[PDB]
Design a protein around this nucleic acid. Sequence first.
DNA 1: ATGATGACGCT
DNA 2: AGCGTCAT
Length: 430
Amino acid sequence: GPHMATGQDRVVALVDMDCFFVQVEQRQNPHLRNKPCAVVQYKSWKGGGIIAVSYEARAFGVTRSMWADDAKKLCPDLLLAQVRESRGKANLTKYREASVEVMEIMSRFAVIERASIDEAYVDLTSAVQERLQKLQGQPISADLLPSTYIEGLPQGPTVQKEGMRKQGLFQWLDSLQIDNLTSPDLQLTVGAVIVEEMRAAIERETGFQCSAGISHNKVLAKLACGLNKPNRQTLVSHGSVPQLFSQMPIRKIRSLGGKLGASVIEILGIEYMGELTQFTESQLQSHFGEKNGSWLYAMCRGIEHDPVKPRQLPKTIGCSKNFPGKTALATREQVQWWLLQLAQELEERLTKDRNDNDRVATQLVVSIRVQGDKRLSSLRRCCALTRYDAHKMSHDAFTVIKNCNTSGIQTEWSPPLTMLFLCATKFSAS
DNA sequence: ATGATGACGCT
DNA sequence: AGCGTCAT
Ligand SMILES: Nc1ccn([C@H]2C[C@H](O)[C@@H](COP(=O)(O)NP(=O)(O)OP(=O)(O)O)O2)c(=O)n1
Ligand SMILES: [Mg+2]
Ligand SMILES: [Mg+2]
C-alpha cells in the first residue's frame, strides 16, 4: 500500500578510476599514453606479475595476474612500467599518493567513504536537495549529462555507441518530472549532474579519468559503475532493476563473488539475481542465515541500506611479502632481516600518517604463512605498538612468532615461512 | 610463481 | 583474541 518501502531514500555514487595504476604511470611518462601498457612488479619472474592493464592492452586479452612474458605473447607491442622497489619489496607509495589527490577532490563535494585505493562511495542525498532548491524549476538539459548512460534505455519504437547513449538520455529526460521534487528518478538525475562535475574536476585537477555509478545504494552504484567503463557514468534507476537483474549472474553483485554466492546458486538452483525474488525472506534466512537472508531478499529487489560511512582514512596500515616455494624463509636471521625490512617500511608510513592525520596506532599484528598450509594467513599474533621504531617492532614481531619454530636445530626455521605480514591497527587520536 | 594490501564477520 | 571471507 502506501507503506511499501522502495529503497529510494538515498542518492549514492561509486567513483572508480580507470586502470588506475596505469594512469598514474602514464601521467608521469607521456610516452605510455594511449598505448597498450601494463604495470608489473618484480621483473625477474617471467617479466613481472601484471597488476594493472590499460584498455588498449585489454583489447588484446592482456589481464591482471598474467606474467608479463605471457602478456607479450598476446600483445607484442605492450609497454610496461614497473613498481618502485625498496628494501627488497614492492613499494606502492606513488599510487597511494595519487589516491590522496583524487580523494581530496571528491571530499569537496560530499561525504565520501574510501572503499579502495582507487574508489570511493558518495552520499549525494543532501547535495541533491540543495541543488534542487537552487534550480528554481528549470528543466535538466542533456548538455549537463555529456557522459551519462541511462541503464535500460533506449527502448521501444542508431548503430553507434554515442548515438545509443543520447537517445536513451533523451528518452529519460523527456519523461522526467522536473516540477515534482520528491521523485527518486529526478533525484538520481540531479545526482548524476553533480557526478559529471565531480568527474570533470578529478580529470581537470589530476589528469586521471574515471567512471561512476549513480543509484540508490552502494551495491547498485558499484554495479552501475562497471556497465560502461571506461570514462563514462551510468545511472541505474529503481525501475531498471527487474530487467537488469533478470540476466545478471549472481556472482557480479558485491559480496556474492565468493563461497556465499556459489551456495546461493547451488542450494537454490538459480543463475540470476532476479530469480531470488521467488523466495520468501524466511526461506532465504533458513538457507543462508538471518542477515544474509534478509539482505538477499531485499537486494534482489534493488533495496540495500548499508550506509556510506564517513571514512577517508584506512583503519589499518600494513606491509607484507610472500616467499613462495623455494624462497620460503628457512633460517632464523632470514626471518629477522625481512621482519626488519617490513618494520622499516611500516615505520615510514606510520610517521607520515601521524603527521598528516593526527592519530597513532596502538596495536601491532604479526601474521605468517608456512609452507603447505592452504590459507591466506597461517597464524596471527598481536602485541602493543608503543613506539614508531623499526627495530623495536621487528623485535616484538619476532618475539611473538618465534615459538612457531618447530625446528630442532638452533639456527634453522621450520616449517619454512612463505609469508610475513606486519599490520598497525587500533588507531587513537594524537 | 601473480602479489600487496584493506574491511569486516564469526566465535 | 584469532581465524575466515571478500574485496581491489
Ligand atoms: N587484485 C587487484 C586489483 C586492483 N589492484 C590495483 C591496481 C588497479 O589499478 C587499482 C584499482 O583496481 P580496479 O580493481 O579499480 N582496476 P583499474 O586497474 O582500477 O581498472 P578499471 O577499474 O578501469 O577496470 O588497484 C591490485 O593491485 N590488485
Ligand atoms: Mg578502477
Ligand atoms: Mg576499483
